[PDB]
Design a protein around this ligand. Structure first.
Ligand SMILES: O[C@@H]1[C@@H](O)[C@H](O[C@@H]2CO[C@@H](O[C@@H]3CO[C@@H](O[C@@H]4CO[C@@H](O[C@@H]5CO[C@@H](O)[C@H](O)[C@H]5O)[C@H](O)[C@H]4O)[C@H](O)[C@H]3O)[C@H](O)[C@H]2O)OC[C@H]1O
Ligand SMILES: O[C@@H]1[C@@H](O)[C@H](O)OC[C@H]1O
Length: 392
């Protein structure tokens, strides 16, 4: 794997792009999404400052609300791109406004998944892949830049947040939504990330939240007493993808049960299909295979997923049944982007076409550019050999 050798595949170079052009492409993506026109192009906003210096956020320009996912992806993008100033400003906002620091609040130790631009939470509860990316980006920051103090002691922040994700106790108390009860963020016996710590829907998962590539990082650098647990989670996730992905198409559902079966959320029964969450599953397993070389099923799974999307050429939807029936929409940049990241594991040379397809895109504009854009920029970095394990 790339971590052992230090050699990350440059998939764009493999399909014949020059390094000058690859650098232009990444830089254009970043400049547009971070510093482009505020109404049509940018998803990053500078929001004054406080005692820790500048504040900024990545946000869903559609809803006009901040998402913990977007903040955490912002941090990952910026650390990968060596953009410390933007990283610190995003982190300052997440830690200042999103992080729940009251030990009697049921979201204690978690980041509000949905928050308004003035810091008013829409929902105090987390979207746990936010936490997963926050912790990992923080470890990467420590590696690349060294640790600061206070909230910029990135390694100490990561250790605390991660320990609490495993060891959080059950807490019942007041929130913006009424009295709620929440637990830990990983199931202690299953060693799987939860879809939610809310006790009413806690015993479920989401394939797109499984990040064995990052669990391996935590297995190396987390507090000692948790390293075996994280190592176990990495094995468990590799098995999870093998069970959860359809055996013909490799499509996964948005939401899932611990045993690998789809889960229909009461408020969103269509979660059993391949939708906006599940786009990312192939990135997660392909990244894991590229870095660590342990998911022996990842190459065949990525081959199957690309073989399926090849049958959709010219009639591309972005919502599918797991067996491959189109359920609506047209092509999206976010799905193009994630499908290109399959090439981190794929063996069949059709992967060149999917990488080429990502290469041909422009940065997103208009109302849906946040989710399309953060997926786009992450996929550009993976495909350029610029998204690396920075181990402290
Ligand atoms: O129930 C709560 C959970 O929902 C919560 O999870 C978080 C929110 O949901 C997930 O992230 C969101 C995924 O959906 C995105 O919305 C759209 C989806 O469509 C994308 O593509 C468009 C499709 O249509 C085309 O016409 C158009 O051109 C395309 O761009 C669009 O780009 C997206 O913006 C949201 O933006 C994401 O935030 C994820 O699980 C969590 O972030 O967790 C708590 C739980 O209580
Ligand atoms: O409260 C939880 C909320 O934050 C989300 O979806 C699941 C709910 O149980």
């Amino acid at each position: 794997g790339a971590v052992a050798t230090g050699e990350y595949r440059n998939l764009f170079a493999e399909i014949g792009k020059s390094e000058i052009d690859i650098q232009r492409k990444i830089d254009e993506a970043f400049q547009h999404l971070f510093y482009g026109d505020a109404k049509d192009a940018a998803v990053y906003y500078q929001a004054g400052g406080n005692e820790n210096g500048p504040l900024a956020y990545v946000y869903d320009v559609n809803s006009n609300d901040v998402r913990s996912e977007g903040m955490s992806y912002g941090m990952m993008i910026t650390v990968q791109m060596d953009k410390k100033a933007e990283f610190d400003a995003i982190w300052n906002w997440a830690k200042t406004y999103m992080y729940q620091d009251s030990p009697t609040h049921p979201a204690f130790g978690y980041f509000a998944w949905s928050m308004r631009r003035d810091g008013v939470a829409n929902d105090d509860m987390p979207a746990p892949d936010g936490e997963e990316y926050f912790v990992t980006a923080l470890y990467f920051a420590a590696a690349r830049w060294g640790n600061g103090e206070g909230i910029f002691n990135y390694q100490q922040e990561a250790d605390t947040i991660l320990s609490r994700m495993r060891h959080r106790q059950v807490i019942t108390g007041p929130t913006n939504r009424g009295v709620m009860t929440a637990t830990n963020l990983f199931h202690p016996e299953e060693a799987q990330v939860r879809f939610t710590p809310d006790i009413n829907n806690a015993d479920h998962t989401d394939a797109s939240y499984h990040l064995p590539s990052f669990y391996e990082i935590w297995a190396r650098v987390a507090p000692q007493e948790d390293r075996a647990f994280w190592a176990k989670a990495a094995d468990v996730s590799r098995d999870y993808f093998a069970k959860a992905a359809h055996p013909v198409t490799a499509l996964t559902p948005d939401y899932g049960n611990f045993d690998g079966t789809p889960w229909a959320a009461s408020w969103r029964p269509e979660s059993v299909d391949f939708r906006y969450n599940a786009w990312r599953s192939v990135m997660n397993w392909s990244m894991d295979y590229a870095w660590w070389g342990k998911d022996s099923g990842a190459p065949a799974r990525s081959d199957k997923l690309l073989a399926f999307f090849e049958t959709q050429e010219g009639k591309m939807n972005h919502l599918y049944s797991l067996d491959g029936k189109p359920l609506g929409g047209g092509p999206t940049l976010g799905l193009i982007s994630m499908n290109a990241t399959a090439a981190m594991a794929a063996t069949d040379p059709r992967w060149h076409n999917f990488v080429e397809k990502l290469w041909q895109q422009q940065p997103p504009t208009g109302q849906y550019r946040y989710y399309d854009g953060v997926l786009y920029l992450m996929a550009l970095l993976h495909c350029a050999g610029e998204y690396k394990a920075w181990i402290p």
